[PDB]
Design a protein around this ligand. Sequence first.
Ligand SMILES: *[C@@H]1O[C@H](CO)[C@@H](O[C@@H]2O[C@H](CO)[C@@H](O[C@@H]3O[C@H](CO[C@H]4O[C@H](CO)[C@@H](O)[C@H](O)[C@@H]4O)[C@@H](O)[C@H](O[C@H]4O[C@H](CO)[C@@H](O)[C@H](O)[C@@H]4O)[C@@H]3O)[C@H](O)[C@H]2NC(C)=O)[C@H](O)[C@H]1NC(C)=O
Ligand SMILES: CC(C)[C@H](C(=O)N1CCC2(CC1)Oc1ccccc1O2)c1ccc(Cl)c(Cl)c1
Ligand SMILES: CCCCCCCCO[C@@H]1O[C@H](CO)[C@@H](O)[C@H](O)[C@H]1O
Ligand SMILES: CCCCCCCCO[C@@H]1O[C@H](CO)[C@@H](O)[C@H](O)[C@H]1O
Ligand SMILES: CCCCCCCCO[C@@H]1O[C@H](CO)[C@@H](O)[C@H](O)[C@H]1O
Ligand SMILES: CCCCCCCCO[C@@H]1O[C@H](CO)[C@@H](O)[C@H](O)[C@H]1O
Ligand SMILES: CCCCCCCCO[C@@H]1O[C@H](CO)[C@@H](O)[C@H](O)[C@H]1O
Ligand SMILES: *C(=O)CCCCCCCCCCCCCCC
Length: 326
Amino acid sequence: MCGTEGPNFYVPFSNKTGVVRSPFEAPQYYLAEPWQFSMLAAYMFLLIMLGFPINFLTLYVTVQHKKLRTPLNYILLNLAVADLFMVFGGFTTTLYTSLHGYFVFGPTGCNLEGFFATLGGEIALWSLVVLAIERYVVVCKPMSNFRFGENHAIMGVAFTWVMALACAAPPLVGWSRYIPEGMQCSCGIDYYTPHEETNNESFVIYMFVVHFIIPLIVIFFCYGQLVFTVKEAAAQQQESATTQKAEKEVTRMVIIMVIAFLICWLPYAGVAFYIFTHQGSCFGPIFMTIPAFFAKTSAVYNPVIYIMMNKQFRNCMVTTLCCGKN
Ligand SMILES: *[C@@H]1O[C@H](CO)[C@@H](O[C@@H]2O[C@H](CO)[C@@H](O[C@@H]3O[C@H](CO[C@H]4O[C@H](CO)[C@@H](O)[C@H](O)[C@@H]4O)[C@@H](O)[C@H](O[C@H]4O[C@H](CO)[C@@H](O)[C@H](O)[C@@H]4O)[C@@H]3O)[C@H](O)[C@H]2NC(C)=O)[C@H](O)[C@H]1NC(C)=O
Ligand SMILES: CC(C)[C@H](C(=O)N1CCC2(CC1)Oc1ccccc1O2)c1ccc(Cl)c(Cl)c1
Ligand SMILES: CCCCCCCCO[C@@H]1O[C@H](CO)[C@@H](O)[C@H](O)[C@H]1O
Ligand SMILES: CCCCCCCCO[C@@H]1O[C@H](CO)[C@@H](O)[C@H](O)[C@H]1O
Ligand SMILES: CCCCCCCCO[C@@H]1O[C@H](CO)[C@@H](O)[C@H](O)[C@H]1O
Ligand SMILES: CCCCCCCCO[C@@H]1O[C@H](CO)[C@@H](O)[C@H](O)[C@H]1O
Ligand SMILES: CCCCCCCCO[C@@H]1O[C@H](CO)[C@@H](O)[C@H](O)[C@H]1O
Ligand SMILES: *C(=O)CCCCCCCCCCCCCCC
């Protein structure tokens, strides 16, 4: 008796006192104080104010600088669009619902907001995976006579969309479901109830293997092989000071990317491992949603790592922000 069930929702609060209401109809101030809903709104405001310009500017400078329109950069533009899906599908809606204290758009808006917020985070995840694969292919050259071109980069972008739909679409047609989560102001996959009608258990396993384990394996493999190949080549050219500088910075960047991924990936593993053990207690609205709470900031720090630290993008944005000069 941890929460209150209803059609299309699970409020993580007991109704033994009779105060629980539908998250589609009335504010959830028994889950959190009104000022804590305000702080949730302030958090959404921070993410919008930093997340929209950085990701929009990534698209804008690509229009004003011909050198950026390389196939190896297509996936980075795909990343910037995905973050805009998170910013407008998720953060903007949540800022609005937050200030009402419940999901005022009803179960239909729940499926829309949940689909587009999940699709945005999914496209971003697989863009990082596809980028790791493309870089591994270009550097480690695992195919004897192969050249990465425009058509290959388009496949890579299309691949992220297929994988993203493979996660975000089934809950709209009866495999798992979208419900309000956490403080009930935004919607997502149901990892909270074993809704046997939609076979929630098998979707969690599918999400865990395909959309959680596999991305980590691919990112670690591709980048490990890449760092190995680069350190191998530099070892054969130690007379070149620039070759050694290039090896050092490639390694430093791979570490940063992998640390950035782990910072977003481990909290889910931690929370899930804590839920696998200790399979006895009730989980507050915050607990199973702490990883998602902090994973939202990836809409800001991913473009900072993959674009603002890209030597080309940086100079083009400086020139664009400086009205043409510098
Ligand atoms: C968490 O738990 C609470 C408490 O159990 C639930 O809230 C109750 O929900 C029921 C509906 O299922 C409410 O019952 C309905 O109340 C209507 C209004 O009643 C108020 O007004 C009348 C005068 O009009 C007062 O006399 C009364 O004291 C109330 O203040 C009634 O119009 C409804 O009557 C109709 O349905 C019943 C059958 O349920 C028939 O017997 C009637 O003839 C009529 O057809 C009905 O009684 C109840 O008022 C709610 N209580 C509170 C405190 O809100 C939540 O739904 C639950 N949360 C979740 C998410 O499930
Ligand atoms: C992009 C998101 C749609 C997706 C997401 O929301 N997930 C949360 C639920 C999920 C799958 C992943 O996590 C689990 C952990 C343990 C057991 C089952 C699990 O199911 C996600 C989020 C962040 C990262 Cl880092 C990754 Cl790789 C993937
Ligand atoms: C993000 C900021 C972290 C620290 C904030 C701690 C604020 C606690 O502040 C207290 O919270 C109570 C909650 O109902 C209020 O009723 C009290 O009036 C208030 O003093
Ligand atoms: C850009 C942000 C705009 C957000 C507008 C939020 C409007 C909140 O609307 C308020 O919701 C309450 C229920 O929670 C009602 O009781 C109030 O009457 C209503 O004014
Ligand atoms: C390094 C990984 C970059 C992509 C991380 C995207 C974070 C997605 O976060 C997900 O968003 C959904 C909709 O808001 C929520 O329903 C999920 O609970 C949450 O895990
Ligand atoms: C997922 C892939 C992560 C790759 C991280 C590789 C980090 C290697 O880092 C390197 O390891 C060498 C070991 O001799 C050290 O001598 C170097 O100082 C160090 O730069
Ligand atoms: C700094 C400590 C923060 C603890 C995490 C608070 C978790 C509250 O739960 C939150 O509810 C929101 C509205 O439904 C969702 O948008 C968030 O994804 C979810 O984390
Ligand atoms: C060239 O590269 C620089 C051109 C001149 C730009 C100077 C203005 C930058 C100010 C950005 C910071 C605004 C902070 C807003 C606070 C919310």
